[PDB]
């Protein structure tokens, strides 16, 4: 699936 990078 699409992804927009690491989060916190």
């Amino acid at each position, epitope marked *: *699936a*699409v*992804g*927009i*990078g*690491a*989060v*916190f």
Partner: antibody
Amino acid sequence: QEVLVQSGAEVKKPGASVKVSCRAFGYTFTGNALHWVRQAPGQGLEWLGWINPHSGDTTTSQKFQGRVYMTRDKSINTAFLDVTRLTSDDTGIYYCARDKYYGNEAVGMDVWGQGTSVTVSS
Amino acid sequence: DIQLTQSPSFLSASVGDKVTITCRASQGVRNELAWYQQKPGKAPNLLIYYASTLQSGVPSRFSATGSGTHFTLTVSSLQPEDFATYFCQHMSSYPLTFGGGTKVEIKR
């Protein structure tokens, strides 16, 4: 507890810009990607784009690229949507919606704001 | 883009009925598919993700199946609160898109 609260209804004239806000409560704002989705009256759902609230990185639907802009202010747990160069086709309800974001990818939109009505007219 | 086609667009049923609604994708989306319920004046609510997994708090009478291009959502026995519009959505590639919705109305 986990909720998104959006700014109130707006009217703008064609060619102008509208800025709508969405504030996260009851969870860590920077922990989930956030989508913007709109619904024209009587119509279905249209994805505008999404933002990573931690990094600020965005991906915009190419139909809206350079026209719709997503930003965030982490200090106030708030995301913003700027829809510019407005036309009557932009009339509708605008939602922010959190992604579950399992595996740092899109999974499903589990918390939705209440929506912001935007009317574009002269 | 990938197009999601839902059928039927309008489903008539009675309280207590078992019904199944269909979502077809124009290209393969694997399991990367979600279902939502929406009622007039309200934001959608997430029902299903990963094509078959129930979202927390959703009643067990909801279930869903499929992979690739063909997906279904089933309500085992409809209750009055289930008459609503249902949407499918894929996230397999950009742009994210939704199906056109299936509105479930009560027979009388």
